[model samples]
Target: GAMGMSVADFYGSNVEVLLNNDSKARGVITNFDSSNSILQLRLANDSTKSIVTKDIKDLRILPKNEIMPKNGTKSPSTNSTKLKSAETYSSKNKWSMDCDEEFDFAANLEKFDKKQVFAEFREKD
Candidate 1:
């Protein structure tokens, strides 16, 4: 029920990203928390870059090259009663998961139904 998969969920894998401006980058997933809609990538040059999730048009889990770095989970379910309300954060067809939880919601994008489900969130405080 999310934007299909999140590129920020892959912290230990490699990935390739296609930005809205047609820019691309391939790197390793050092760490990420995509629910906030932003991503941090570690390149082979040992440099770190920050990218907003919305600016990322497309992405893929790949090797050290020919693709981007890691992190993203499977689509969420609008029917699953096992998820907590704060664990389903959504963005542009995105999810509505919690702010502090880890990003391991489901399977990877390669193993999803690619369902398009979107929602919003608010401060609980």
Candidate 2:
């Protein structure tokens, strides 16, 4: 099993990685609407850039490992309450929710025109 941080943490970390790799631009998920099957992303690279759901190509939600400390020792387990709902749905629930309906980052990047994108930033001292 691949041991890693929770999905939320993973997403946050990935955003940081992207920002770090590209100093001229920053990325953030402005909206993630599951009910409507939409995700909005804001990019700042010299101006403000907004990306909508249809532009996305793929979205993946990974399960998180629960970390617990026992007697000064740390233990990890997949029995995370956060993932219980997803797991139950995947296993017990027969509902087939197409993952593709989710966000597609790679395809979004390819589809959108980079020139139209702009960067926005906060004033720093």
Candidate 3:
């Protein structure tokens, strides 16, 4: 049931960008912060724009050896394991798209030392 929720709602109910490991467009952050997470893209020929996560959609790291079924159920034999190690970001800009893409904000933010966190501008590209 959790997987059924879009990545936006699953994290913090904010729209996110989908970043993956591609050299052409590397190091893009999805949500700059809680207040500015959604991506709004302008159409090439018009003022109309579409919003995206600005976060990565492809490089999602699932639980180790866990297979999500076609119906979105996990295997019974799956074991709980940590998928990623924790690190602190001095600046939101210092955060790689890969890091933000893989981490869940609520849980990941707690892993860092408190002083390391601060608010910064989330510029639209």
Candidate 4:
């Protein structure tokens, strides 16, 4: 505890150290050399590193029983929705042609020519 922190009690504690250069490291505080103001960290990658106390901007001590937040929260199920049943008609009812209205074919036939109509254009032979 040189500057303002006494990390002597935090020995062997897991922590995340934020350095003055905006870089960060997470590991266990294995050793704290008060004479040299050095903190030795045993990283999670099975590697060890030393950091001067002056270079550390912040230190966060983590709980030994800390539980990581659950990843990939499940979305709501779309298949659980209840849809309304479709209405059905009787099999005896007419499913094709409509007989309620009347149509006159002779009237329509007399209105137009029986043969195909075409323009007789004479062009240069």
Listed in order, each prediction's TM-score against the native is: 0.41, 0.26, 0.18, 0.44
How close to the true structure is residue 89 of candidate 4, measured as C-alpha lDDT? 26
lDDT of 4: 0.63
Give per-residue CA lDDT, model 1, range 14-98, as digits (tens).
Answer: 6889999888787766666747866778765557888767888888865322233325463432223566655534344433454
Candidate 3 residue-wise lDDT, 1-125, digit = tens = 35464555433222223455442222222333447556443322333333444544543322322234434363543233653345533345544654333344455446543445477654553
Candidates' C-alpha lDDT: 0.60, 0.39, 0.39, 0.63
Residue range with the least summed lDDT across 10 consecutive positions in model 1: 63-72
Q: lDDT score, residue 90, model 1?
A: 35
lDDT of 2 by residue, 8-62 (tens): 6533221311222233323454555557645444433323344444544444332
TM-score of model 4 vs. true structure: 0.44
| Rank ordering of all candidates by lDDT, starting from the highest | 4, 1, 2, 3
RMSD of each: 17.9, 19.5, 15.1, 31.3
Candidate 3 Cα outliers beyond 4 Å, as residue runs: 1-9, 12-34, 38-61, 64-125
Candidate 3 structure lDDT: 0.39
| Ranking of candidates on TM-score, top first | 4, 1, 2, 3
Higher-ranked by TM-score: 1 or 4: 4
